[PDB]
Amino acid sequence: NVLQIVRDHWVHILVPVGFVFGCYLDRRSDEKLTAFRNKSLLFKRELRPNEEVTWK
Amino acid sequence: PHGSPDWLKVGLTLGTSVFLWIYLIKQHKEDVLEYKRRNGLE
Amino acid sequence: LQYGPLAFVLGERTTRKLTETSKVITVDGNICSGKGRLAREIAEKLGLRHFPEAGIHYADSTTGDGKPLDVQLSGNCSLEKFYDDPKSNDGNSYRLQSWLYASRLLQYADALEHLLSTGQGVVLERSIYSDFVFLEAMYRQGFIRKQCVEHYNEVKKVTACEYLPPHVVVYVDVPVPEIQSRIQKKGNPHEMKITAAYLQDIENAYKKTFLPEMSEKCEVLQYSAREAEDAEKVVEDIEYLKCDKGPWPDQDDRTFHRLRMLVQNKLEVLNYTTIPVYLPEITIGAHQSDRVFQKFTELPGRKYSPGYNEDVGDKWIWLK
Amino acid sequence: MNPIIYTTLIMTVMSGTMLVMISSHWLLIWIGFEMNLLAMIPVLMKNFNPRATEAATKYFLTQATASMMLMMAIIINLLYSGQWTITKMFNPVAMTMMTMALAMKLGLSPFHFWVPEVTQGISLQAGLLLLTWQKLAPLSVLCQISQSINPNLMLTMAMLSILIGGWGGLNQTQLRKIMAYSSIAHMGWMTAVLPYNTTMTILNLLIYITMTLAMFMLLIHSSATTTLSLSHTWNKMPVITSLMMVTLLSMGGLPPLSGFMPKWMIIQEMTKNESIIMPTLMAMTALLNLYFYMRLAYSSSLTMFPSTNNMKMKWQFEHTKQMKLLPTMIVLSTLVLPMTPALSSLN
Amino acid sequence: PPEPTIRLQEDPDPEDENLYEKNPDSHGYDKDPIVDLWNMRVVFFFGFSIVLVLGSTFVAYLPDYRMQEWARREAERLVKYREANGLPLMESNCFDPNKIQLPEDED
Amino acid sequence: ARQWQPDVEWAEQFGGAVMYPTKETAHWKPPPWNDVDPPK
Amino acid sequence: TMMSGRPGRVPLQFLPNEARSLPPPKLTDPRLVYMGFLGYCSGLIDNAIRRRPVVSAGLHRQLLYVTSFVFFGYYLLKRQDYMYALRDHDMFAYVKSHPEDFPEKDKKTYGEILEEFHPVR
Amino acid sequence: MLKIIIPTTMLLPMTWMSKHNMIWINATVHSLLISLISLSLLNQLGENSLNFSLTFFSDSLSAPLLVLTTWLLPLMLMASQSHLSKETTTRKKLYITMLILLQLFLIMTFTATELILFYILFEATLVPTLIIITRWGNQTERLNAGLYFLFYTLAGSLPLLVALVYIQNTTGSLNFLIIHYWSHPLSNSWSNIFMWLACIMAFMVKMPLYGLHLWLPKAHVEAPIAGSMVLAAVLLKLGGYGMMRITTILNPLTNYMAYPFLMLSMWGMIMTSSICLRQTDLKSLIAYSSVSHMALVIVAIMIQTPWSFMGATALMIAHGLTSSMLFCLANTNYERVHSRTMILARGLQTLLPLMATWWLVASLTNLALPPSINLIGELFIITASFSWSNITIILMGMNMMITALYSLYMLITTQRGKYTHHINNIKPSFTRENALMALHILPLLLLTLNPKMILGPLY
Ligand SMILES: CCCCCCCCCCCCCCCCCC(=O)OC[C@H](COP(=O)([O-])OCC(O)COP(=O)([O-])OC[C@@H](COC(=O)CCCCCCCCCCCCCCCCC)OC(=O)CCCCCCCCCCCCCCCCC)OC(=O)CCCCCCCCCCCCCCCCC
Ligand SMILES: CCCCCCCCCCCCCCCCC[C@@H](O)O[C@H](CO[C@H](O)CCCCCCCCCCCCCCC)COP(=O)(O)OCC[N+](C)(C)C
Ligand SMILES: CCCCCCCCCCCCCCCCC[C@@H](O)O[C@H](CO[C@H](O)CCCCCCCCCCCCCCC)COP(=O)(O)OCC[N+](C)(C)C
Ligand SMILES: CCCCCCCCCCCCCCCCC[C@@H](O)O[C@H](CO[C@H](O)CCCCCCCCCCCCCCC)COP(=O)(O)OCC[N+](C)(C)C
Ligand SMILES: CCCCCCCC/C=C\CCCCCCCC(=O)O[C@H](COC(=O)CCCCCCC/C=C/CCCCCCCC)COP(=O)(O)OCCN
Ligand SMILES: Nc1ncnc2c1ncn2[C@@H]1O[C@H](COP(=O)(O)OP(=O)(O)O)[C@@H](O)[C@H]1O
């Protein structure tokens, strides 16, 4: 029953939340390593007309 | 023993926490503003 | 303001509370006697506070709710079994003696705390002094071993070396034939089996060692069964004598502060009652200790501090 | 004693240490040491017994001899250069006299013999004070004149202190003597990095003070001064024993605990100066301290020792007096390794 | 010798308890039948069904980030080119010698 | 069937004045429970 | 690097004026979050020592622990960043002022560097 | 890499905020889900690595070890559920907390782009294992065992730290990528010889090396089942992983310095396999078998050829799984008979046929029956050694023969013959034990279908 099993099963939601937070933090840390994006000699690519960044 | 929640101590603890948080937020604001003014960013 | 150094610094002094009426007194008597009646009568006549003689569950009356706990959680000993089979294999006799000594120590600490915090004197039955007589009896009857008496002497020395003995001791003298007659008249089946040798040995201990040693540092009032009936004469005897030979007149305000700090904080009072001397009658193995401690924790108002127990009914827990 | 007199004596001890820390004149530093010694004795003799009197008289003899040696060093330095300012000594003999005086004041080997006996004689609070606050002034003076010290003598005394502490702690059943030998070893660790970096000395001092405060307050809370007395604490306060085990693990220098921060850093610093053998020996010797910490942990929290029947009564009572800073001390002594770069604050 | 031979007060060693006794169909997880059954169900579903089958299928169909087929195709076209032009298949030098400056010995 | 826990004999190893007793240090005695010696 | 005698050092300032020319740490700094976590741990341990429900005994006291730890950690982080900035500044100035002690290495390609080869057999 | 680290951290508050009778279920379910999530690290590249950030990076040597570490926790919980039944909720939560902390430290250790961070976590794993051994072990020797397991480790690990900081004082960095790209030869010098020894001995002691293996039988025998599982499966592989990482700076000095360790391992594998033939304890026999397998891995790492490294990776994974299964079987017998003496409970095939099948398959994988990954690693290492020197074949074949001998001796003694008459408390096998055995063994026979997942970065 709602508002009753929540008080007994609230703990279960924590691990899944951590997985999402870790994914978000991984992307945020990825955003700080773009000093060479579209600058490597191997993947110097000219941007598409409706493109901002080659990868995110 | 047999004692009530001392509302004087509770009020003082909440007041200290709130004052410290408000002071910290202000201090960060003038810190950012002073850094921007000194370094000529904005 | 819970009493501490700061209270002493600002105002709290106990020399002004002493009004020549405090007179911590204790009553000594043979098993089954008028000492209880005489102690109470002295307590109402002199305006003092009476402390009933400490039992197995005296400590239970001062903690949590005053109702006693189980035998397995409080004392792990019984007087009835000691009377039935004093030469037991499981060492009930010395375990009983040690638990009773610790209870008397706690009660003496409580009485001293009351006297020092209020200025009102107290009346006690058998105290930490004269608690040894039963021990000696148990040794002379063969109920306990010698290592028990060395352990008891060590604990008694280390504990009683830090408190002030009572101002005047009141002893009610009772012959053994009449003590046995009164025992038979009570009708208690377990007290029926107290051998006259045990009573006589107990009696010998009080007269031979207890009376002279308290005579040289305190004041003694030897009474008989007939003269213990009229408490007016006993109260008059207490009033007439003046305590000037004991250590009490030499005490002062800072020593009183130290003693008042000691009598509070019952953990330090009972600190040396559990010294690591491994006597089979009292040492407990890890498994039994863990199981009994777990049982004690599961009691209603014993898992947390007194003000933090929800099952008892404490409220506002999350704001205390 | 009277609380007013006790507070006055404590503030006089702190004012002596402060006088030593803020002055620039050698006479004023000597005066601060004298004030500290004068006000320290009644604190050691707060509880009267023959053992405390013996500890106080031994401590006084040692500290007075050290003070006379320090004044001799000051006067010789004045003789060879009419200077009173605390700076580089300018005299080889004076520096040695000063180094021995400060080593005697700190308790470094071979002047360590007084520390275990004095710590055993005095109470637990006196021992806390003696092992925490009484190291600040000599170490501050050493930091001020670190450019003068002969590295050979300081490093010899540091290695000797580490070895002596490690070996002497192995033979102890008394908790106060264990703390004293631990303090001797930690002083040895602190003085081995003075010739190279005083910041590492201060960092080690702060970490050691935090751990020692936590351990002494835990020992006072569970009022035990022997191994067997401490073995009874699990039957009343198992959480205290768990915290004590974690603190002991930290004091042994295990990562990721806080106690790993100093030695690591010190080792790192000593490697920048092409000193390889000495840090290696220091770590190998610190393994002894870890061994007797682990023995204490085995006896206290990792195994359940037999108890007594009277302990049941202790189950019905709770502590009236509490240390406010004990949780903070435990946390700061166990879980500050991630904040290591903050040592740039020149702590 | 009036010693009891009882060195201390100790609980007797308890006998091991059979989970099948109070509960057949006991699954060996818990003495509570409901918690026992649900523990069995979660272990079997999340161990055998989810991880073991779906994870194995996921590992089986992992994209070629090791570039095995890519290297095979590159080698195929390179061999086709060199065989057509008569070049001696693989060269013995990994780098071109013209762009390496050896130190003259003059011994 | 039950995990081993220290008994009295195991505990008495740690009850002496010092660890690792020697012939010279055998006569040493542990200090009093309270750090007070009889004035004799 | 002993900076105690560095010129123009006011004795007992936690943070000098020039430190205000540096960017202050963000309030979501991971080190600040660790400071708050340490405060929370201190609160839980304080509850445990006093035999109170560890998670939910005193919310005001736990909040005060967290807040004080965060406050001190913020100021400590500011001082740490300032000291590291000074170290870098002094290092760069010294390298700039002593060119003869930091001569430029001649850029040399691996094509004309002879490295001894050791086979693994 | 945080998408695996954060859920493992959240395992702790979830464990401590759980009901008294839901801790095992919640821990098992969420640890299995974490294992499933970590399974996506296996998508490795033929190029450098999976460089997530400045702090953590993944490699096809690190990924199988990470997946095995994540998979081991649910099995450890299932194995621990039985013997912790009579214990309080707080202590069971503490036990699960120790397991979770061990997993977290191992996960961060295997990624650990920094060598000092690797050392810190590699030594942080020491504390949970020591607490588990010395708190929830049964016999009185556990304390002694713990001491050994402690000091040996530190006796090897303290010099390494010094060496490590020394390197950063000369090279300027301890990042593994920078170290690999800027590596330089070590001249034959006494200082370089001692740097080599300081770099190697710490990982040698935890393999363990044959002369330095005394701590392992004690620690594995006196530990509880979860402790034995984690010690044999993951903790022994830390030395191999560290050697594989650190041998990049030790060339060409490894050519000379490898000889004493090569001789020690090649003779000690024979010695320990022979010791297994005369063993009165199941756990001690399994521990000595682990010593032999890790001796083979040491030989492989010291030879430092591509086939050596591939064989060593495969053998590390296979040995972890097989030894965990063997310890679990021994513990299933022990929880019934309470003796841990191999000769006591006999003829268990007639009473426990499915458990006998599990025993047979575990012995077969320990025996290195093809095409198991155990034999894949064995054969790759043996071929590399043969190329190194043709005379190694005698020692390798003798080790194979003795390994088969003691594996089948262990199977025949416990499962075959006649049942012991006076033992009447052998209850039918629980679903929990059978599920544990299957969850050990199916990953092995399923990994033999895709060997490149466990052959390392030189595949
Ligand atoms: C790597 C970093 C990441 C991980 C961090 C790890 C550390 C974190 C925590 C640090 C300290 C904080 C807590 C310490 C206070 C003690 C509390 C306690 O005693 O437990 C009882 C308490 C429950 O019991 P209770 O019914 O309340 O009261 C009964 C008594 O308290 C207790 O009943 P009792 O006293 O009658 O039972 C006796 C028992 C009780 O004695 C104890 O258990 C004391 C606890 C150990 C002391 C810890 C020392 C300080 C921490 C340093 C740890 C070092 C870590 C480094 C690695 C080395 C590992 C040693 O003692 C024994 O049994 C002795 C034998 C045990 C074997 C030897 C002991 C091993 C010690 C190693 C423990 C290390 C891990 C501890 C984990 C936390 C434990 C709660 O536990 C808790 O509930 C607290 C757990 C934390 C609460 C989390 C709340 C957050 C959840 C919701 C928000 C979600 C967050 C995410 C946001 C997103 C959501 C949307
Ligand atoms: C183990 C944890 C220890 C924590 C320490 C106690 C925390 C509470 C302290 C309360 C606040 C302290 C700040 C003091 C206010 C003013 C500071 C000012 O007076 O001093 C300045 C400097 O203040 C201190 O240096 C900063 C103290 C900060 C200590 C933190 C670093 C510890 C290492 C990292 C461990 C993690 C700790 C963080 C978690 C709490 C200027 O000093 P200066 O007159 O010019 O030279 C003297 C020092 N010399 C001789 C070495 C050069
Ligand atoms: C009971 C009696 C028997 C009844 C059942 C009869 C049926 C038997 C058939 C099953 C066994 C026979 C073997 C035949 C294999 C067929 C499937 C196989 O060919 O697929 C494999 C594919 O499977 C995978 O390769 C192996 C599975 C990976 C295992 C991961 C483990 C699961 C996670 C558990 C936790 C980890 C613990 C261990 C840590 C290391 C290999 O395919 P591959 O040619 O290559 O490429 C796949 C397809 N491509 C071309 C599109 C790419
Ligand atoms: C116990 C369980 C196992 C633990 C681990 C055991 C593994 C440790 C083995 C150490 C590896 C080798 C150490 C030294 C190798 C150097 C080569 C040497 O053996 O050969 C001769 C070395 O000559 C002599 O050995 C000189 C040293 C003699 C003193 C050594 C003591 C001999 C026995 C000690 C063994 C004890 C080991 C354990 C110590 C606690 C060649 O002489 P030379 O070509 O001119 O000089 C070569 C070195 N140079 C080039 C750098 C200059
Ligand atoms: C399982 C227990 C094993 C115990 C540890 C075993 C490993 C022993 C390895 C040596 C320990 C310390 C080595 C130093 C760490 C590396 C640092 C380094 O390489 O620097 C060297 C320094 O080299 C040394 O100082 C080495 C001195 C070693 C002293 C301690 C000896 C310990 C025992 C020696 C005999 C046994 C050696 C191998 C034992 C293997 C384990 C059984 C050169 O630097 P510089 O001198 O500054 O430059 C040269 C120009 N001046
Ligand atoms: N230290 C002791 N040792 C043994 N028994 C004791 C001790 N103290 C009190 N008792 C027991 O307490 C019982 C009650 O005490 P008592 O005063 O004689 O009877 P009553 O309460 O009826 O006046 C007695 O049976 C006595 O044996």
GROMACS .gro file of C-alpha atoms in nm, chain H residues 34-172:
model
  139
 1067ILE     CA    1   2.639  -0.359  -0.977
 1068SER     CA    2   2.807  -0.665  -1.130
 1069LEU     CA    3   2.577  -0.640  -1.432
 1070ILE     CA    4   2.660  -0.271  -1.474
 1071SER     CA    5   3.034  -0.337  -1.440
 1072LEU     CA    6   3.004  -0.603  -1.710
 1073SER     CA    7   3.001  -0.323  -1.971
 1074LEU     CA    8   3.369  -0.244  -1.906
 1075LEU     CA    9   3.458  -0.552  -2.114
 1076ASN     CA   10   3.415  -0.351  -2.437
 1077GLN     CA   11   3.784  -0.269  -2.466
 1078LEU     CA   12   3.988  -0.123  -2.751
 1079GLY     CA   13   4.279  -0.245  -2.954
 1080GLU     CA   14   4.435   0.096  -2.888
 1081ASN     CA   15   4.560   0.247  -2.562
 1082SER     CA   16   4.287   0.223  -2.297
 1083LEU     CA   17   3.958   0.352  -2.158
 1084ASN     CA   18   4.089   0.672  -2.000
 1085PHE     CA   19   3.784   0.796  -1.810
 1086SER     CA   20   3.952   1.086  -1.628
 1087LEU     CA   21   4.279   1.199  -1.473
 1088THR     CA   22   4.220   0.961  -1.181
 1089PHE     CA   23   4.074   0.638  -1.322
 1090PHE     CA   24   4.139   0.440  -1.639
 1091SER     CA   25   4.036   0.096  -1.761
 1092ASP     CA   26   4.234  -0.166  -1.950
 1093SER     CA   27   4.168  -0.514  -2.080
 1094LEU     CA   28   4.386  -0.638  -1.795
 1095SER     CA   29   4.186  -0.438  -1.539
 1096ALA     CA   30   3.837  -0.510  -1.676
 1097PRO     CA   31   3.824  -0.889  -1.613
 1098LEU     CA   32   3.958  -0.837  -1.260
 1099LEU     CA   33   3.698  -0.566  -1.197
 1100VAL     CA   34   3.415  -0.788  -1.323
 1101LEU     CA   35   3.534  -1.081  -1.111
 1102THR     CA   36   3.556  -0.853  -0.807
 1103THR     CA   37   3.200  -0.731  -0.860
 1104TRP     CA   38   3.075  -1.086  -0.919
 1105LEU     CA   39   3.243  -1.222  -0.606
 1106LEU     CA   40   3.044  -1.012  -0.357
 1107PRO     CA   41   2.700  -1.176  -0.411
 1108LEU     CA   42   2.858  -1.520  -0.381
 1109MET     CA   43   3.035  -1.413  -0.062
 1110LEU     CA   44   2.705  -1.289   0.082
 1111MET     CA   45   2.531  -1.616  -0.007
 1112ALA     CA   46   2.813  -1.813   0.154
 1113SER     CA   47   2.810  -1.595   0.468
 1114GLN     CA   48   2.431  -1.609   0.518
 1115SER     CA   49   2.450  -1.950   0.687
 1116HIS     CA   50   2.709  -1.922   0.965
 1117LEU     CA   51   2.605  -1.568   1.067
 1118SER     CA   52   2.248  -1.669   1.157
 1119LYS     CA   53   2.288  -1.653   1.537
 1120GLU     CA   54   2.446  -1.306   1.540
 1121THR     CA   55   2.304  -0.961   1.605
 1122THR     CA   56   2.181  -0.727   1.333
 1123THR     CA   57   2.449  -0.465   1.402
 1124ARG     CA   58   2.732  -0.718   1.371
 1125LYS     CA   59   2.591  -0.866   1.049
 1126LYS     CA   60   2.562  -0.513   0.910
 1127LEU     CA   61   2.925  -0.456   1.012
 1128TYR     CA   62   3.030  -0.776   0.831
 1129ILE     CA   63   2.849  -0.667   0.514
 1130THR     CA   64   3.008  -0.324   0.555
 1131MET     CA   65   3.353  -0.484   0.564
 1132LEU     CA   66   3.276  -0.676   0.245
 1133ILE     CA   67   3.147  -0.361   0.072
 1134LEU     CA   68   3.454  -0.161   0.177
 1135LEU     CA   69   3.680  -0.437   0.047
 1136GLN     CA   70   3.500  -0.429  -0.289
 1137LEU     CA   71   3.523  -0.050  -0.307
 1138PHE     CA   72   3.896  -0.050  -0.234
 1139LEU     CA   73   3.959  -0.328  -0.488
 1140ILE     CA   74   3.758  -0.147  -0.757
 1141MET     CA   75   3.947   0.177  -0.703
 1142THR     CA   76   4.276  -0.017  -0.688
 1143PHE     CA   77   4.230  -0.183  -1.026
 1144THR     CA   78   4.170   0.149  -1.207
 1145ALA     CA   79   4.401   0.380  -1.011
 1146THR     CA   80   4.580   0.573  -1.288
 1147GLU     CA   81   4.833   0.692  -1.026
 1148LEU     CA   82   5.093   0.461  -0.874
 1149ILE     CA   83   5.072   0.626  -0.531
 1150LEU     CA   84   4.692   0.606  -0.540
 1151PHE     CA   85   4.730   0.242  -0.642
 1152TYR     CA   86   4.962   0.184  -0.346
 1153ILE     CA   87   4.727   0.359  -0.103
 1154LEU     CA   88   4.424   0.153  -0.208
 1155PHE     CA   89   4.635  -0.163  -0.246
 1156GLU     CA   90   4.729  -0.121   0.121
 1157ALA     CA   91   4.382  -0.001   0.225
 1158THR     CA   92   4.246  -0.341   0.125
 1159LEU     CA   93   4.453  -0.479   0.415
 1160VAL     CA   94   4.231  -0.343   0.695
 1161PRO     CA   95   3.891  -0.501   0.604
 1162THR     CA   96   4.051  -0.841   0.544
 1163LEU     CA   97   4.236  -0.830   0.876
 1164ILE     CA   98   3.919  -0.733   1.064
 1165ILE     CA   99   3.720  -1.009   0.891
 1166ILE     CA  100   3.985  -1.270   0.971
 1167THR     CA  101   4.047  -1.170   1.334
 1168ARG     CA  102   3.682  -1.098   1.424
 1169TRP     CA  103   3.469  -1.366   1.254
 1170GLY     CA  104   3.718  -1.654   1.241
 1171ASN     CA  105   3.654  -1.959   1.456
 1172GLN     CA  106   3.979  -2.107   1.587
 1173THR     CA  107   4.226  -1.947   1.827
 1174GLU     CA  108   4.498  -1.931   1.560
 1175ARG     CA  109   4.312  -1.661   1.364
 1176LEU     CA  110   4.478  -1.380   1.560
 1177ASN     CA  111   4.819  -1.527   1.483
 1178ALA     CA  112   4.715  -1.571   1.121
 1179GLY     CA  113   4.611  -1.207   1.105
 1180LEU     CA  114   4.948  -1.096   1.238
 1181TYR     CA  115   5.125  -1.291   0.966
 1182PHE     CA  116   4.891  -1.165   0.696
 1183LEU     CA  117   4.966  -0.815   0.819
 1184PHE     CA  118   5.338  -0.798   0.866
 1185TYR     CA  119   5.455  -0.999   0.567
 1186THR     CA  120   5.253  -0.759   0.351
 1187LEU     CA  121   5.398  -0.448   0.511
 1188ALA     CA  122   5.746  -0.600   0.515
 1189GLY     CA  123   5.719  -0.603   0.137
 1190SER     CA  124   5.518  -0.286   0.089
 1191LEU     CA  125   5.710  -0.029   0.293
 1192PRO     CA  126   6.021  -0.028   0.067
 1193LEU     CA  127   5.799   0.004  -0.242
 1194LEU     CA  128   5.655   0.333  -0.116
 1195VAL     CA  129   6.007   0.473  -0.080
 1196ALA     CA  130   6.097   0.354  -0.429
 1197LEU     CA  131   5.776   0.504  -0.564
 1198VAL     CA  132   5.838   0.851  -0.426
 1199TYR     CA  133   6.200   0.827  -0.538
 1200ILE     CA  134   6.084   0.766  -0.894
 1201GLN     CA  135   5.860   1.071  -0.890
 1202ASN     CA  136   6.150   1.278  -0.758
 1203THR     CA  137   6.352   1.176  -1.063
 1204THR     CA  138   6.096   1.120  -1.339
 1205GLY     CA  139   5.859   1.395  -1.224
   0.00000   0.00000   0.00000
